Design an enzyme around this catalytic site. Structure first.
Site, PDB file in Angstrom:
ATOM      1  N   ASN A 119     -10.679   6.133   4.037  1.00 27.95           N
ATOM      2  CA  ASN A 119      -9.289   5.701   4.116  1.00 27.95           C
ATOM      3  C   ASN A 119      -8.372   6.692   4.826  1.00 27.95           C
ATOM      4  O   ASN A 119      -7.228   6.332   5.142  1.00 27.95           O
ATOM      5  CB  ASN A 119      -8.732   5.452   2.701  1.00 27.95           C
ATOM      6  CG  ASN A 119      -8.546   6.737   1.915  1.00 27.95           C
ATOM      7  OD1 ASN A 119      -9.435   7.586   1.881  1.00 27.95           O
ATOM      8  ND2 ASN A 119      -7.378   6.893   1.284  1.00 27.95           N
ATOM      9  N   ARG A 258       1.819   8.194  -3.944  1.00 26.35           N
ATOM     10  CA  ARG A 258       2.029   7.391  -5.151  1.00 26.35           C
ATOM     11  C   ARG A 258       3.526   7.216  -5.422  1.00 26.35           C
ATOM     12  O   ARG A 258       4.301   8.176  -5.333  1.00 26.35           O
ATOM     13  CB  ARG A 258       1.358   8.027  -6.390  1.00 26.35           C
ATOM     14  CG  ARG A 258      -0.169   8.257  -6.307  1.00 26.35           C
ATOM     15  CD  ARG A 258      -0.976   6.940  -6.262  1.00 26.35           C
ATOM     16  NE  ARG A 258      -2.417   7.135  -6.436  1.00 26.35           N
ATOM     17  CZ  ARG A 258      -3.311   7.218  -5.448  1.00 26.35           C
ATOM     18  NH1 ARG A 258      -2.954   7.126  -4.171  1.00 26.35           N
ATOM     19  NH2 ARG A 258      -4.599   7.397  -5.746  1.00 26.35           N
ATOM     20  N   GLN A 287       4.076  -1.528  -9.254  1.00 26.45           N
ATOM     21  CA  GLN A 287       3.388  -2.066  -8.062  1.00 26.45           C
ATOM     22  C   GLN A 287       2.467  -3.189  -8.530  1.00 26.45           C
ATOM     23  O   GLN A 287       1.627  -2.957  -9.413  1.00 26.45           O
ATOM     24  CB  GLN A 287       2.583  -0.968  -7.338  1.00 26.45           C
ATOM     25  CG  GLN A 287       1.980  -1.343  -5.967  1.00 26.45           C
ATOM     26  CD  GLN A 287       1.624  -0.108  -5.118  1.00 26.45           C
ATOM     27  OE1 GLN A 287       2.437   0.371  -4.326  1.00 26.45           O
ATOM     28  NE2 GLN A 287       0.410   0.408  -5.291  1.00 26.45           N
ATOM     29  N   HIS A 311       1.971  -2.441   0.127  1.00 31.68           N
ATOM     30  CA  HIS A 311       0.909  -1.435   0.062  1.00 31.68           C
ATOM     31  C   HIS A 311      -0.322  -1.939   0.828  1.00 31.68           C
ATOM     32  O   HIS A 311      -1.107  -2.745   0.311  1.00 31.68           O
ATOM     33  CB  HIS A 311       0.581  -1.110  -1.391  1.00 31.68           C
ATOM     34  CG  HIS A 311      -0.489  -0.075  -1.546  1.00 31.68           C
ATOM     35  ND1 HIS A 311      -1.445  -0.130  -2.539  1.00 31.68           N
ATOM     36  CD2 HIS A 311      -0.763   1.038  -0.823  1.00 31.68           C
ATOM     37  CE1 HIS A 311      -2.258   0.906  -2.424  1.00 31.68           C
ATOM     38  NE2 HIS A 311      -1.869   1.625  -1.386  1.00 31.68           N
TER      39      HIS A 311
END
Ligand code: CYC
Ligand code: CYC
Lengths: 355, 143, 355, 144
Positions: A119, A258, A287, A311
């Site tokens: 990622n 975060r 979220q 996101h």
């Protein structure tokens, strides 16, 4: 060899694009392989509430596979009821939704693995993209054209070059170091970092970075700040009204780490007052973002300075292919009894930490 | 919330043991940290050159700062109903956090044990039992 | 000693921002200096029509100062009426609006100068920003948040990383070379260029670039194409339906050079059919864009793939300060009679080219 | 669609036939015109030689003859239409600083168009040669 994996439902979008692997319809591209191998595969997006498909099968399951873009929370309650569980996989990177402390302290025989590395490039590119969009005032400029306007002075009055700015990262692990690498040819004034442990001297010199040991000293000299750090005590609620008043007046802040590292209402007030000139990123708390979350409607005094997205930075089609391949590799190391895992992928080997 | 209102009203209207415990923890908090730090470093001489996560004069002062953090946090818990604020502010990812810093977690637990002994010794027998449960809640998360 | 300069009117925006130098209200920051010397200064935005303030003073003016963001067209007709004209300055870079051929062939004693270098970093950053926004699918992602939605699968299905793509520039002068420098740490598969003149070999090797000598061979292997070339015959209308059909299916095209290098209706049809996955940039033809210009409303099949802005990349506050300093330097070289111009700034010295 | 354009088109269809005869010669003998004119150019400008030689290659010599074909086809279009406007907008706008950036001597491109003018008008009547000659001259004047 019963396997439960929870992903989101993509609906009609799954048929538009076959490389959208991380969804309930496309099953990470491994369904035919698992069936040929003689294993049973339950696929569901129903993970909340005691009446859920996930809870219906957890007392039985041998393996559970999760994603950070639709996380099944592996709580101690669920862990006690999971009598056959031997392996939890993250198809991606990020394990906050799993109670690693409980497993490790109780001494349960559960391995926990993720596809580390898969990622990092995608997130680092998203940071560079967000910095340029904010500093150069892109969002209101595209708005003028869609809306059939043309008024250059209204855009130019709050647009800058990134050349000559001082740029600081909070956190210098895999993602923050790759942000620093991509910034070198843009000719900043200086690159700075803060971290609980030092970068090696060779790595510092390759990018010309300088370690600053005090968080308030770091942000007070920076035009641009980016957050690339984990969530724990001492980072939770770090970006509050008191620390924000130490920032330079009129700088830019980016966060793809975060959401709970910021106090949401405090950064919105800083943007409206001009303490910050812009804020952007793709992570939220709570979220998914409620429809009235304050980060949706906040603006600066000119009506811009907002570059939020949902996101998604780590879910590009190039990243999805990497952890389809990485998940099958991990599953096979288990199936064969070789247990020849990549060292970097192990976060718990039968309830124990490594080294 | 009605359960929270009830615990606050108890501090205002009913028992006075929470008030007495808070009087001691605020009134001699500097003596509690100084005395407990001396005892910690005698039991864990890892103010020594090697690893010594707390080796410097500067790192020793950072250690005593953290001890002050937990004493102020336990004080808040005593004044309030309960241990919930202790968990959510001081214990979140505390094992992984200290691990990334190089500081041995079981030594932080020992520091809270040493603060428990000094503070509790200044209290009545009954107040010391009540206060002691709050210190234990922190110790259990780190040992 | 008589000077006419034409700039746009910025209105209320000029009082919001002191560093917005290139406008009628703020006068490039050199009024006061010019008044302290013995010179007269006419400042106006009124340049079209034979009844214009510009034409009112052309017969008399010694010096004219222009900007590429609101250009006064210095036609041969006006040149014939300008009985005292001796110097034309561009406060910026770009001289298409001046009839250099007429001045040169006729042999008039007018010199022409611009402040070269002052814009190249700002434009190169805008190219990097547009490539990331298109490739990573940013525009529809921000729109979901503004509009109070949240549907990750609809964004992820057309989002990629820039790592591993092949990237080509048409033109490798000052701007295109700085685009290549900033792309190096993003790990592209390969960097390619096309130009009437070769880069020196040390410059090619610093960025790992390969020259391709045939325009159709260049675009047929590229995932991303960027245009950084001047406008002339054989560049005018180069991007047409026939050449677009040689691009790979589903790539991205960026243009911050000149609008007329494209056939506007042909790129819009390519975006709708999926020959192109996205288009972006800040230059138009005609310019300013009519309210019905086809590039305002065009989209790809998913309703995205458009990252157009109005023409502003070279007008950031950092670039405007450079323009103001460079214009006063040029004027002073003339006023003193030293004529000690920077060599790179000269385009015409008394009606003829230098070498 | 403008009344002046419609008038120029109707003249080609309905009135004089000299534009029709000029176009017949330029299309029918186009390959002979370029080959014969290229030979004459390189005899007058031996800068197909090693040094500078912007056209020194066998490959670069073929690119030069390609450009000559471009201008002949563009002059043909102008004859068929009313006028020289399409010649200006397509073949002459950036020309000059374009050729300068290529290393091509601009006055040698003018000479190539002079050589095409001589071969082409040699195949025409006296009157047709005068009318056709004006279109060639319009290109030559922009490059010398
Ligand atoms: C003393 C008993 C032990 C000791 C302590 C020690 N701690 C650090 C550094 C940090 N401590 C914390 C703790 C917190 N910050 C918070 O906000 C909270 C919530 C109330 C807690 C619990 C943090 C965040 C840090 C790092 C950041 C900072 O300093 O602000 C050090 C320094 C370590 C280093 O090498 O840099 C030390 C020495 N060390 C021991 O050995 C004792 C057992
Ligand atoms: C022959 C008379 C002379 C000669 C020619 C020559 N030209 C090039 C390269 C180019 N020529 C053009 C011209 C045009 N392209 C158009 O679309 C139009 C409008 C109709 C014109 C006028 C262009 C654009 C180029 C460059 C791009 C391309 O090749 O497609 C060369 C090659 C030069 C080199 O060194 O690469 C040459 C040799 N050269 C002479 O010396 C003769 C006098």
């Amino acid at each position: 060899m019963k396997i439960v994996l929870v992903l989101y439902d993509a609906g009609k979008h799954a048929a538009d694009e076959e490389k959208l692997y991380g969804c309930t319809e496309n099953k990470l591209g491994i369904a035919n392989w698992l069936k040929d191998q003689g294993h049973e595969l339950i696929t569901t997006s129903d993970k909340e509430g005691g009446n859920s498909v996930l809870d219906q099968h957890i007392p039985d399951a041998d393996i559970i596979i999760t994603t950070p873009f639709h996380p099944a929370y592996i709580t101690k309650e669920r862990i006690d009821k999971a009598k056959k569980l031997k392996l939890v996989v993250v198809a991606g990177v990020g394990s906050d939704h799993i109670d690693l402390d409980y497993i490790n302290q109780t001494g349960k025989k559960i391995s926990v693995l993720e596809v580390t590395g898969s990622n990092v490039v995608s997130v680092a590119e998203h940071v560079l993209m967000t910095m340029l969009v904010l500093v150069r005032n892109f969002v209101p400029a595209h708005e003028q054209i869609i809306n059939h306007d043309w008024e250059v002075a209204a855009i130019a009055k709050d647009a800058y070059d990134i050349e000559g700015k001082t740029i600081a990262t909070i956190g210098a692990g895999r993602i923050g170091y790759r942000v620093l690498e991509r910034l070198v040819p843009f000719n900043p004034k200086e690159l700075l970092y803060y971290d609980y442990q030092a970068l090696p001297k060779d790595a510092e010199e390759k990018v010309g970075a300088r370690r600053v040991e005090n968080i308030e000293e770091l942000v007070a000299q920076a035009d641009i700040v980016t957050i690339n750090a984990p969530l724990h005590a001492g980072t939770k609620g770090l970006i509050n009204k008191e620390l924000l008043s130490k920032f330079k007046k009129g700088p830019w802040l980016v966060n793809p780490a975060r959401g709970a590292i910021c106090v949401a209402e405090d950064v919105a007030a800083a943007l409206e007052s001009g303490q910050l000139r812009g804020y952007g990123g793709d992570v939220w708390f709570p979220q998914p973002a409620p429809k009235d979350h304050p980060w949706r409607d906040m603006r600066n005094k000119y009506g811009a300075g907002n570059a939020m997205t949902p996101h998604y930075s780590g879910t590009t089609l190039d990243a999805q292919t990497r952890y389809a391949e990485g998940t099958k590799n991990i599953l096979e190391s288990f199936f064969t009894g070789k247990f020849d895992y990549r060292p970097q992928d192990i976060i718990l080997l039968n309830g124990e930490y490594v080294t | 919330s009605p359960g929270e209102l009830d615990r606050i009203k108890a501090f205002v209207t009913s028992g006075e043991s929470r008030l007495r415990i808070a009087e001691t923890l605020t009134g001699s908090r500097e003596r509690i940290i100084k005395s407990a730090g001396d005892a910690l470093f005698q039991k864990r001489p890892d103010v020594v050159s090697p690893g010594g996560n707390a080796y410097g004069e500067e790192m020793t002062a950072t250690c005593l700062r953290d001890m002050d953090y937990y004493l102020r946090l336990i004080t808040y818990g005593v004044v309030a109903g309960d241990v919930t604020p202790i968990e959510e502010i001081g214990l979140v990812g505390v094992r992984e956090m200290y691990k990334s810093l190089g500081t041995p977690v079981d030594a932080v637990a020992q520091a809270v044990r040493e603060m428990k002994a000094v503070a509790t010794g200044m209290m009545s027998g009954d107040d010391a039992a009540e206060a002691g449960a709050y210190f234990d809640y922190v110790i259990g998360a780190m040992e």
